[PDB]
Each structure stands twice: as C-alpha cells, then as structure tokens.
Symmetry: D2
Subunit: 494 residues, 4 copies
C-alpha cells in the first residue's frame, strides 16, 4: 500500500519559534504532548504564555515595518518563498504524515494522501496569488486621480485547531503571507508538533526573521493573549463557537482588531426520493465519520424523504458496522481515536442523551476498550429536532438520521439552527438542486456529494458558524486592508 | 397593450451628424417600405463614403482630449444614458409602432419585448459608466504600476434589420458608457427608429458628435466604415459572409479592432427524460420567433429516438395555429419577412428541403397576395448533409432530427462552422452540466431557449462571432487598456 | 443657484416606521428634538427602545424570507426602486435640505448643494450595482462544478450619526438594499427627522413592507438593543471609537453578528516645502472647519515643513478670521452652531486644555453669541504631540498646526496614534506623493486636496478608526454573504 | 556571470509534433546562422503548409473533450508550467548561450535578462491556471445564469527573432495556463532555442499535441497558420505590414481570433524639470537595448527647448562608449544586427537622415569585416517629416527633437499610426498624470523606460497592435466566454 517512514520518528522541534530562532518559554514551563491512540507521552513542548506572545508580536511588528525586507521585496518573491516552502513540505512528507498521525490520532493513509497533499496544494495555490493581488483605478467624480492599494493588514494572530493541524496551519499562513502580512501562530495544545517542524522549514526556505512566529501553549493563556493584544491587527480563529464569541468580544474590548472565525456546525443533508441512493448513503456516511467525526462540517443531521428512509437507514447501518478500531499507524485499522479524554467524554455523554431521549440506536453506542479514546461508530435513527443529538455539535462518530415528507418543511427544519457552516443536497433534479441550495442558510452547499473542500473555493460559515471566508479569491480579501489614494489633478480625461 | 392613438407621422429621414440633420452629399435618397403591405413609407437620405467621412470627423473631434465628452464625469455619461432611456420610454408607443410598421414585427412583441429590452439595456449600461475600473499592480521592481481602461475612440457600428432598435442600443449603450464616440449605420431596410432615437440623443443633451447616424447600403456606407483610416473599432451584426469582408477590410486598412455577431445554425438536444411540452414549446419559440429572423434561431432540433415521433407530432400541431397578416392587426400572430430577397432565399431553401428528401410536415410555401409571407414550415427526418441542416435560413422553417447516441449527437451538434447558441433539454443535473460544457456555443440554454439579457455576455464561438456583447465582459471590448508604470525610490507592499 | 422653501417647514413624520406603517413607541414615551442654532424644540419623536427594535427586526426578517417579494424580485428591480427613491429625494430636495439645516445646525447652502446632491448621487450609484453583483465559477480540483452566490446577508441593523444624517442614512441603506438585505435603522437622537421623511418616500417608491424599518431613539437603549439582538445578522455603526468598541463586544457576546465600524480620527496632513502653499492652506482649512469641525475625517493635525511653517500659519489665521456665525438658514451666515450642549462643552474644554498646555492661540478660543452652541473658529500653533488637542478628537472648529524638519520623523509622528481614518499629503513631487501616501497608516490618503469623498471609492479606517469599508465596489462586499455551491459531475472539461 | 564550460552542441533541429521529432514533409531544410560571424550553425527542417496541417491535427486531437489536457485539474496545468520553468532554469547556461549565438544577443543580457524573464513569466502564468474564473449573474427572470471562461482551442503563435525565448514564453505561457493547445512558428532566423524548449515540454510531461513547434519561413508556414480553417486563434508579434496580412487572412479564412503586437515609433517627452541624467539614461537604454531591435524602441525623443542642448550632449557622450563585437566575448557591449536585410534597411534609413538634414552627432555607418554591425548613431535636430522620424528603424539609431509647447508636442507624439509605448520624464505630479493620460500608447512609462513585467498587460494602441498580452487582462484573450442559462421554478437573491 502507501510509503512509510523507514526510520523511527525522532521529535526534534519543541520550542517557541520567534525571529527564526528557537526560544524557551519565559516561565521555563513545558507541557506534555500525547499519542491519543496509546496515551503515551511523545515529548514536552515549551509552554508559551502572554510574555512569549509579546515577544512574538514585537518580532512580527518589526518584520512588518515600512522599509523592511518583507515589505519591500517583490510580491512575486513572497510567492516564490511560499512555493519553496511547499517543496520542503513535500520533501518531508513521510515524516510529517507520520508525526501528524501519531500526535493527532489520524489514520496514516489519510494523513499522507489527504492532509499532506492538501497542505502542499493549498500553499502552492496561495503562492500563485501573491503578485496577482490588485487594487483599482476609479473614475471618481471631479478632477481627481483615484486608486486603491490592497495592502497587508499587519500582524495577524492565528489560532489553529487540533483536528487538521497541518492543513489548518497552511490555510491560515498561506493567504496571510501571500498578502504580505506577518503572523503569530498558536497551534492547538494537543497538536503543536507538525507546526514546529514547519517552522524549521520556514527558516530553511529563507523567510525573513519575524515574518512567521509560532507560540505553542494553551487557549486561555496564549490564545487569550493574542486576542486581547494591543499591537495585533487581526485575529483568525478556528474552533468552537463558544470560544469564537470570546475572541470577538476580546477584539472589541482591546484594539478593535479585525476578526475572522470558522466555528462549529450542525450541518444538514437533505436526501430526496429521486437521489442516487448509494451515492447519498456513501457521502453522508463519509460526511459524518471522516476523521472520527472530528470535522466542523460533519453531516450531523441527515433528513431523508419518507419513501426511501428505511432503506437509507439500513444501508447506513451496514456501512457503519465495517470499521476496525485501533492505532492509526497500524495497517488494516480504519478508525482511529478521538483526540483526548475531554472530547471522548463529551461524545459518550451525547450518545447517552440520545438513548435517554428516545432516538433509536441502530449500532454502536459505547466505548471500545480502555486504552486511548475510542468510540464505536454509532448510528441513531428516528431522531427528532428537539433532541440534544439533533441540536448540539457532537464532534464524534455519531450519525443522526431523520425522516421528512414535506420539502418546504424540511428546509425550515434544516435552517432552524444558529449554525450554518455547510449542507448537502441529494437529488437528480436540476430545479430541486438549484432552488434547495439557494434556500439553505449555509456557507458551502454540496450537491450529490459532501465534504468537498479545495483551495480554489471560499469556505466559511453563515450565522454563528463563522465570520468571513477562507481561501479562494474571496478569502484573500480578509488579509488585506484597503487604502484609497485620491490625487488632485488639473483636468481628467476618460 | 396600449396603442398609438394618432397616425404615425414620419419626421426623421436624414443623416444625423453633430446633433444636426444633413442631406446626403450626393443628393440621393432611398425608399423604405412596409413589408406587410409593400407600400413605401418614405424616402431616406442615402449615405455613402462622403457622408461617413463627415460623421467620422465629427466623432473624432468629440473624442479629443479636453472635449466635454472626454472631461465629463463618468457618472454624467451614465446620467445621459439613463435620460435617453426615459425618453425612449416616453416615446414607447411611437417607437413600437414605427418598429412594427417598418420591420414587419408583431406589434405586441415590438412594444413588450423590443422596447422593454431597449430601455432596460440602456439603464443597465448607464449603471456601468462610473464602475469601469482599472487595476493597481504589484509589479517586480521599484515601480508604481496602474492601468486605465480608456475608451477606444471612434467606433463604427453596423446594425441589422431584424431587431433595429434593440441592436442599436446593444451597440451604443456599452460604447457610450465606456466613453467612446460612435458612427452608426442602420440597416437599409430599417433606418427609421434609429433616426428617431437620434432626435432623443440630442434632446437628452449628449454633446455634438458623440453619436452620428448614417443611413445607407452595406457595400457603400458599411464598407466605408470598415475601411476607414480614422475609425478605431468596427462592430457588426449580420451575416457571416459580410463579417468576413469586414474583418478583411479592417486588416487591409488600419487594423481597427473588430467585434462580430454573425449567423448561426444553433442546435437543440432533447433527451428522453425532458419535460416534453416545455421542450416543444421552447424549441418552437426558438425557431419561429419574429418569423424565424433571429441569428440564434433553433434551426436544428435533435430529439432522442424514443420521443422523436411524439415531439414531431406536437411540434406540427403547434406550428399550424398561426394567423398570418399585418403585424399591427390584433389577432395576427405571424408577420411578413423583411423583404423580397429574404423571402426568395427562404422559399429556395424550403425547395431544397423537398428536393433533398426531408419530410415536409406542414407549410412549405408562400401565403397571400401582398407582402412577403411564408407559411410556417416544419421538416422532419432531416439529415446532416441537407442544405436546410447546414445553411442559415432566417425564416419560419423548423428542422427536426433524431438521435440515439448522446456522444454522437454532441459531435453532430458541434459539426458546423457556426457556434452562436444551443439548447439542452433534460431534467438530469449531470447531463445538463456535461452537455452544456461540451457544446461549442456562446450561449447554452437549459430547459429554455432564447433567453437573452443585458446582464449576460452574448456572442459566438467559431464563425458565429468574434468577441462578446453586454454583461460585464462585453464592456471590455469598448475599452483600450493603458498601463502606466512610474519609477519610485522604494516600494512597500 | 440657491432655491429655498417658499412655505414654512411643517414637521409631519415623527413616528417609528415598521412594515411601511407608522407606530407609536411601545412605552408611549416621546423625546424632544431641537434646533441647535436657536435652542427651540421642533417637535417630539416616538422614543424607540428594545421592544420597538424587536418589532422592527421581526418585520425585516419576514421581508427577507425565501419566496418573499424582496427576495424573488429581479436584482434590476431592486435597482429601479433605489433609482425611484433618488428621484423622490430630488423632488423633495428643498424640504429635506431645510429640515436637515434646521435640525442639524447645518449651513443651508451646504445642505442643499452638498448633502442632498451627495444623497441623490450615492443612491443612484448604488442602484446601478444591484444587478452587477456577481459570484464566480471556479475550476476546483476534481470532477466538480463549483460556483458561488453573493447573497444578501439578511437583517442589517444600521446606526447613523448626527453630523451627516441624510448622507449617512443613504451610505448605509443604499448598498444594503442594492445587495438585497433588509434593514433596521436607528438614526441619531439629535437628528431623526430627515430619516423619517425618507421613510415616507421609501413607502411611496414601492419598497415591500419590512425592507426598511426606522426606529428613532437613544444609543444605550435602541442602539444597544440592535447590537445585542439575536436575530440581526449584521450591524453597521458610524460614531465614536468608544461606542464602536461596545458594539463589537456586544456582537461577540450575542450572536456573532457581522460588524462594520466607521469611527473617529485624528487625521494628519503633511505639507512639504515644495507644496502649492495657497492650495495646502485652503484644503487644510476646509478639512478642519467644514460643518463646524464635525467630521470624522477632520484634518486635526497639520504638520508643516519648518521653512514654510510661519507663512502657513499666517495664511491659515487670515483664512479663519473671515467667518460669520449665526443661524444656518440665514443668507450670509458661513458658520453654524455645534449640534448640542454636550459637544459644545467638550470643545470648549479641549480649547481650554490647549491654552493651559502652552499651545499658541492664534485666533478664536471661546464661545460666541447669546443663543445656540456657537464656538469661534480657533487656530492653535506650536502644537506638540503630547498635548490633549494633538491626541483627542475635538469635533469642533479647532485647527492644530505643528512644524517638522525630518520627513522620516514626521511620518512616524503622523502614524503614532490608534486612529487611522485619513490623511493628507501636500507636495508637487511624484516620488514623495507616492512613497508618503504608501507609508501613512490611513484608509484614505488625499494628495494636494482634502476631504474628497465619493460614492465610487471605498472609505473606512485603519486601526481603531474602523473595521471594513463603505461604498465603491469594495464596500459592497460587506453587504453580501458568500455561498459556495459544489456539484458532483461525471467528468469536467476546461 | 557563469558560462557554459563545454562547447554548445546543437541537438534539436526538427519539427516537434505530438511530442515527437519529425522531418519536414518536403524533405527540405534551411540554414541557421550566427549573425556575429556569418557562420552556418546547422540546418533545420523547413516546415510548410503540410507540416502545419499535421501540427494542427495533433493540437486539435489534444484539445478534444475528454482528453487528458481538457480533463486535468487547472492546478495541474499550472504545475506543468512551473515544472517547465524549473527545467529552463536547469538549462539556463545552455539556453542563454544558444540564444546569444543564434540571436546576436549579448550573453550577459541573454543570461541575466532573457532567461530570467522567461522563468519568471512562466511561473507567473502557472499561478493563474486555477484562478481563471467565470461569473454567476443575477439575470432578470426565473433563471440561473453562469459563465465559463473556456480555452479557445487551437492557437497558432508566430514568434519574432529579437526575443525568441521570451516571446515564446509570452505566447505559450498564457495560452497553456488557460487550457489551449498551440502550434508555434518561431522566426526563420532563430528556431533553435524554441526547439530546445520543446524537448523540455516533453520532459515536463505535457500531453502529446498540447505544444507543437513548426520552424520555417513567414510566407509559407506563417501564412499557412493564418489561413488555416481549423486554427481558432492566431497571435503574431512582428512588423505592422505582416500584421495586416495576418488579420486579412483571418477574415478570409475562418474568422479566427487575432492578437497582434506590432511595430512602434514610441515617443518620449522630457520636460524641463526632469531629472536629466535619469532621462538621458533611460531614453538611451530605450533606443539602444539589443542593438535597437525592440518594438518599444524610444525612437522619438522630444526635449523641452531649455534643456535640449544639454540633453543631446549627454546623449552623445553616452552613445560613444560601446565596444562592438561577438556577443559571446567578454567585454563586448554591442552585438550585431540579426541579418543582412535588417542591416541594409538600417543603413538606408541612416543615409536618409543625413540626406534630409538631420544633424549627425555620432556614428552613422557600418563597423567591422564580418557580421552585421552598425555604429551607434545619434541624430539631433530631427523634424517630424523626416523618414527617421516616421519609420521604424529597428537599429541603434536615436532621434532627438525639441519642443516648446507641451500641448503641441503631445499632438506631435500622437501624430502617428503607431502607439505601442511612450515615456514621460518630469518630477511634477500633475504633468505626469495628465500627459500619460493624453498619450495614445499602450504602455506609458514615467521617469523610466522599457520596464516590462509579466504582472502588467502589454500591447499597442492603433496600428501597433490588437489586444494585450500578460497580466490579468492578457489572459482574457486566451479564453472564450460561454454563458449558460438554466430555467428554474423560482429564484431568490
Ligand atoms: C476552551 C477553553 N477556554 C475556556 C472558555 C478558552 C477561553 C478563551 C480562549 C481564547 C480567548 C482564545 C483561545 O485560543 O482559547 C480560549 C479558550
Ligand atoms: C450584402 C451585400 N454585400 C455583398 C456581399 C456587402 C458587402 C460588403 C459589406 C461591408 C464591408 C459592410 C457592410 O455593412 O455591408 C456589406 C455588404
Ligand atoms: C453614548 C455613550 N453610550 C452610553 C455608555 C452608549 C453606549 C452603548 C451604545 C451602543 C451599544 C449602541 C449605540 O448606538 O449607542 C451607544 C451609546
Ligand atoms: C515578411 C515576409 N512576408 C512578405 C512575403 C510575409 C508575408 C505574409 C506572412 C504571413 C501571412 C505570416 C507570417 O508569419 O509571415 C509572413 C511574411
Ligand atoms: Cl478597491
Ligand atoms: Cl488591467
Ligand atoms: Cl466568490
Ligand atoms: Cl463573464
Ligand atoms: Yb403590389
Ligand atoms: Yb473646564
């Protein structure tokens, strides 16, 4: 099957990365990092806090100064540095996939084939934009010459989640750097290791010091310090809606820093009677169960037209019973662990609520073993809108299936949530596909597929699933600050 | 459907240059006719090379750096276009009546479709005038680079007889919104509505020389435009054959920019899963609208075998319900062809269909004692090598063909030098997307046909055209890009 | 030419406007509205509070529903409705200019010639965008058809200041409606009247009920209710940086509503020795003194190169002594009153601090007259960076003039502020104009002019002067929510 | 400046079709020369109509719906272009050496400028491949409308001899990034570097038929491209005279789309307040770079009266510092003209200057015993009616003229059928903006000259061109817009 690392993974990078150098935490404190499949400690990482964030921000600010190498180099050269970084990640693909799998509880085949490929491709996409970011010339009323500059914003604080550590790192730094910003990155406490390896590559690629700085640490300490910092121009955060609210609040209270948020969801699928049933079953399944359900876009409410509901459930249950739980580095394993005990506990609790509230348990419904954080793939049918499992983001391998008869009513039910990250629509009918996708209050709507994400398209939430968009052309806007320059002239001509 | 309460009086018949009326330099005039009755409506000044030359000088002068048209706010060019739209709206009854009478165009369509299209298109174009923007560009090196999307200059615009008013606006709207000046040559058959619009251009307050209108013939006035050494751009809508000559003359003269919207032989592909009545109705509309006199006519309808016989049957039933007569007469649902030359060409192609073994299902000859009426005609069992399957007919003549293989029918649909438009009829998402992607056609309609709007670009693939008109994209063709690159001591992102 | 209203202005619209009908406040309470030139009470206006906001939001939500007239009408028809509204405002231009002047303390000639013309032109500009808002088709990796929809966001709460009540009303509703949103508008407590007249014209134009709702009232009541409302999708606010922070905070705490802010400034001008001196004096003067200094963009720090400093001051003082203070409806008056007693007091307090801290008072420096809130046009020279008058936004007719010798240093001084709304650069040199304007941390930089604002160009702040941009092509983005639709297909072709 | 350590061995001399090397159909070959020495470097297969026909069939096949090139990810087209850039970088010494030897091009410029420009341009184009996007459009009525910016198809690309490698990349980069297939005809004088690049195109992994290269003459292979019935678009850089013939043949044949980058007679306007040394230096570079063999050559320098004499003085001093010889020889700063026909034409124009009374300040004749060397030549007191003021020289011949009235000199600068570029030298903001706005030129440089980059669009006004190359805007010309309009039951905003 796939290539593997022929030598044992040695963890080398564990410190705070500022000005292209490695730093101990100011306090001297360190924190442990674990393998969630085995509960073994992999290493200790420097514990960044407010004081470390402050150093990083000073370094990022200095690198952003007018006249600095990063501000004065050709846009095309920023692009070239990003392309070079992509090449380096490609070179270290085995190492990074192995590290990502070990630290993140992520199936190795997925880490190698999906995550690493996504990283490389996304970086290369971003590189291409650097010298194609353009302002406007504007035919303003009066005798004036008016143009706009789409400048970088400045120092961007970027807070990265644990579910796709490498991919999310690139999703953030790629556009930020392509646009000419400098960054202070705070990877998730659970998964700092791949980010720190990437930092070694950032130095190797030749980025000027201070352009990228990485501060491992906890949310309420390092993350909060970023969000309330008086010299950070922008914060980007991916994670829970609850923390998203606190970031936005702290931005308002501190220096009115710009904010982009990619938060939770409770994304619905609507499966019409005319759908290709196998395709719908398969995508809805993938949509819920990919990476042990640990995706913001998880297809966590599947609404199925009455006449095909029983068959849909049956095929979904068959598909869910085929998994082999274990160490994600082990060939033959097809489901890894949840990231940590807190997530594991929360998932089991929500599964209990489902049983208690009268959802029909079709398979799974409990833990698997004591070692690491494994949850049996679980399917609930006859789920109703008022159940906790129908309302709350689970972030685990738990599928909810519901029936509908009225299309108008099921669109209302799909939209009746504060969330709005994504949705899926399954039908062969042109008119239905277009009109349903238009009516759904979701940032991405998939038609006859699910979970198809690419660097070329903008991604983000409606309502409380997010503020702003990442990637594609549109996502680049959020890493620029627009300046209008209006020059008096003696006479204009069209 | 309001009507004109008074008899239409023809007032504007001369050459319009510098907001004034001129006789032709030669003194010659030409007659203009009502194609339904064959009566002569009036005589119009016959513009030729010398008249074109006067118009071009006027347009050039109005385009000079420092002139009112060059120095006014872009928003004010917009205001002028909006005002022109309001004036056309005010004169809607008059214009629809004139368009109907001169053009052989059903009054209800003239009033409800052509005039509305005109007004809406002008208002759309008006809105772009101060939203045309260049770029600032992060060039390598210590430089500040920007672009200006300037007007091109003097644009010669040659307009056809089938949609005289709409096509006039389709041309002048974007040209003027972008800040060009124009020299317009309306079709010999249908100059009258354009000359009325010229009176409104003056009333609206456009500076003199910004719009000039020179009626006359193609080989004289039209050729003079295309070979003129001080015209920066020519735009032409008409036959592919004349399109070729325009492009050639452009190359030979001063390398003027060229946009062309030419003929078609547009196919429809009707799959077995299609809503059959919807397909029959849109394919029917697609071929028979305005007596078949549309570049986009749905002139090859390919129908999957299993529904072919029923499709033909319903199409024939639909085609036998027309009432032929004067397009000003309420209850008439098919007018005349524009003139005797077209009429003759259409009857000749109908004859070729009979001769080459197509099945004549209805119609197939002329109608009546006066004017140029052709019976609505349906041919079935048409094959790809027949003249009626290859040549643009421009008459009320429908061709229906069968297919069994989707892959093969796409090849057949694409096997033409034309490529203006096409239609796809199916309920299936995948088929709709993949078929529309595979068709070599500038506009592809799905479960409809002939849906045109000012918001979307329109134009041909292959020999159906060069460039696009309208929408955001169409505006590009009326601008000339200038890059300005300024040395600076040091740049910052 | 200056036509006037031939009849006495009769105040007719004083109620809350919801669903194209006039409503009393839920509480029954009303508040007085004044003429700041005379201190006389013009009328009483219904005092909207949380409960009134709630009714307005329900109306706006209902009008935004999928399948509603506002959602299903042609984009071009939204545009037509906006153009029609512009025509109606043009029809009522005398009435509106008179009302704006009387209620706002705004010079009639400026109200009629500038504000009303700006309103009409802005609306017409926005109308033209309605059917030119476009998404993308995107050549995503894999066998997919991807497109985007630039949908309206939904219910937009819009909070308008008292300095340009009509112009700011249009600046907000024009783009919001052009994009297809519905709105709940809260005009300033001081100046609700012109907005309520515009509401009558919104109804007359034929906008569907609930598309535009207007709730007069106070900031901490009605304004706070908007900013914390759980069913408002977006809030836009123009006003003080202090309130801006509270809005952003409440957005974060409530439902993560999108936020745009246009806040204060302390905008600098930099006048080089090679500048056209009369032009620079005139524009810097206009920049500070326009509408009694009551502009967010006021040119409130003028830095002048040493060799021309004394002459600059002299000419500035001569220019400032030519005003005639009085009722802004009186022909010949060239300076009106400040909006209210609170502003008046604040301005006089800052003028006192200037004297006290050792700025040189060149002219003015105190109040004027027996009625209304008049402040003498005041010029301070020898201002230094640590003085209150150099740091705090004054919002009155108070000009600060300072000297510099080093261009590098003065750029630092210009940038050394949390503000960043705008700036001015005065020089004949190409290189200086480009490199200085690039270096300044300001949203709009004027070269050899000042205060040139148009609907065609984006406008907004860097740093704590704002979040986002208003108007131009770019400003429209902030009133759309991007939806990506990705459709599985059997095979794609380029 | 690294150099090639081994002797250059010429390996690729054949026609490149379907990633294979072909002999000419006729069997004929043509010689290729070193212009510095007149020695024959090799013989190259002489492509003609029949070879063009094979190449077009290969390109057409590679463009078919469902082919690898049509179906691959846009990002993968980009990757292939990036890989090609890496391979050119690997072979930089070889390519620079070959370009210098065959093109008479100074080695340092070949290595530092041409090769770097090639690599950077390709990398720029690569980045656009997956960023080419259409639109979704809020059309009136119950419809869903979107556009596809498709590749056009088979693009014939005719390349000049002055910048063989750079111009090759300028053409194929955007064409391929957009998804087209190409048939490339390099200049008869300079086919060798293109054929080496073809080997790299294969090595990079482009599918067969995506790029085809047919060496040969203009009136044979070039004319066959321009009149071919299955080529969708032709792009040509070269003389205005041939440009006209290409456009004419396009019109006569199949109405293929046309982009042209032609000659110029580009003016500079130097104001009294200019940084004089900067202006002298850039105007000098502008006219003398690559022995004056640039379409954008700054061939009319208008200088304000009060600084005219000094401008001339400094220009003459600058022109007298060259060392003429073999462009591979270290220390040489001026190479030969490309061939005898150019050499003769240049000397003839220099004679006309003397005859018509221009003041010869330096140079004015040939140099050396072998190869086509012309002394760097400066004329002052040039007037607008002289041949040297009107005709494109394409040699190291500088024309300097005086003006007093700015309004008048703008008219003089604009009084030409050409309009490729211009330069404006001033420190004044207002002058810089208003003069650049008033000039009828595609690129206007302010306080610099000849600053070209892949990020900015480039092309001519008037008879200096049709369309733009490079930048965002240049990509439009390698796409064909398709509007797809789908009927739906009800739309929502
Ligand atoms: C999940 C742990 N918690 C407690 C609510 C928090 C609280 C606040 C933050 C902030 C401001 C940033 C962060 O990254 O993580 C957090 C985490
Ligand atoms: C239809 C009559 N014919 C003869 C082919 C022509 C020939 C040439 C032209 C040209 C160049 C322009 C034109 O408008 O009409 C023509 C008409
Ligand atoms: C005028 C100052 N104050 C009172 C503290 C406030 C405070 C809060 C708001 C909010 C949230 C919205 C507003 O419109 O006005 C305010 C005004
Ligand atoms: C410059 C030599 N000549 C004149 C015979 C030509 C003539 C025509 C062409 C054409 C059509 C294409 C070409 O590439 O070169 C030519 C060169
Ligand atoms: Cl912009
Ligand atoms: Cl551009
Ligand atoms: Cl988008
Ligand atoms: Cl488009
Ligand atoms: Yb008769
Ligand atoms: Yb006080």
């Amino acid at each position: 099957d796939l290539p593997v690392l022929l030598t044992d993974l040695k963890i080398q990078y564990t410190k705070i990365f500022i000005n292209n150098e490695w730093h101990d935490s100011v306090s001297g404190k360190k924190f442990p990092v674990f393998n969630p499949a085995t509960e073994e400690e992999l290493c200790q990482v420097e514990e960044g806090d407010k004081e470390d964030v402050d150093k990083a921000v000073k370094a990022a600010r200095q690198a952003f100064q007018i006249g600095s190498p990063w501000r004065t180099m050709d846009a095309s050269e920023r692009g070239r540095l990003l392309y070079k970084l992509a090449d380096l990640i490609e070179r270290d693909r085995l190492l990074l996939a192995t590290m990502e799998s070990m630290n993140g509880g992520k199936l190795y085949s997925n880490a190698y084939l999906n995550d690493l490929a996504g990283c490389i491709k996304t970086l290369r996409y971003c590189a291409g934009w650097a010298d194609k970011i353009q302002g406007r010339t504007i035919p303003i009323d009066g005798n004036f010459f008016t143009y706009t500059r789409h400048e970088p914003i400045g120092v961007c604080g970027q807070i990265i989640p644990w579910n796709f550590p490498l991919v999310m790192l690139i999703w953030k730094i790629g556009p930020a750097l392509s646009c000419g910003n400098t960054v202070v990155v705070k990877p998730a406490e659970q998964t700092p290791l791949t980010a720190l390896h990437v930092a070694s590559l950032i130095k190797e690629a030749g980025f000027p010091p201070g352009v990228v700085n990485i501060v491992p640490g906890y949310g309420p300490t390092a993350g909060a310090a970023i969000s309330s910092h008086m010299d950070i121009d922008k914060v980007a955060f991916t994670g829970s809606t609850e923390v998203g609210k606190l970031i936005k609040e702290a931005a308002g209270k501190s220096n009115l820093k710009r904010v982009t948020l990619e938060l939770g969801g409770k994304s619905p699928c609507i499966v019409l009677a005319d759908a290709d049933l196998d395709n719908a079953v398969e995508f809805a399944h993938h949509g819920v169960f990919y990476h042990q359900g640990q995706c913001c876009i998880a297809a966590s409410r599947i609404f199925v037209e009455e006449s095909i509901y029983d068959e849909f459930v049956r095929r979904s249950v068959e598909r869910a019973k085929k998994y082999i739980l274990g160490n994600p580095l082990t060939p033959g394993v097809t489901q890894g662990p949840q990231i940590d005990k807190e997530q594991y506990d929360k998932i089991l609790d929500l599964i209990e609520s489902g049983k208690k509230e009268g959802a029909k348990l079709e398979c799974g419904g409990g833990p698997w073993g004591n070692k690491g954080y494994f949850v049996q793939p679980t399917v609930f049918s006859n789920v109703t809108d008022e159940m906790r499992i129908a309302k709350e983001e689970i972030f685990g391998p738990v599928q909810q299936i519901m029936k509908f008869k009225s299309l108008d009513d099921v669109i209302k039910r799909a939209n009746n949530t504060f969330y709005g990250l994504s949705a899926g629509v399954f039908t062969k009918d042109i008119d239905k596909a277009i009109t349903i996708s238009s009516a759904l209050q979701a940032g991405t709507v998939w038609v006859n597929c699910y979970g198809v994400v690419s660097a070329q398209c903008p991604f983000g939430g409606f309502k409380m699933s997010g503020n702003g968009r990442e990637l594609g052309e549109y996502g680049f806007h959020e890493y620029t600050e627009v300046k209008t320059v209006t020059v008096k002239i003696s006479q204009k001509n069209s």
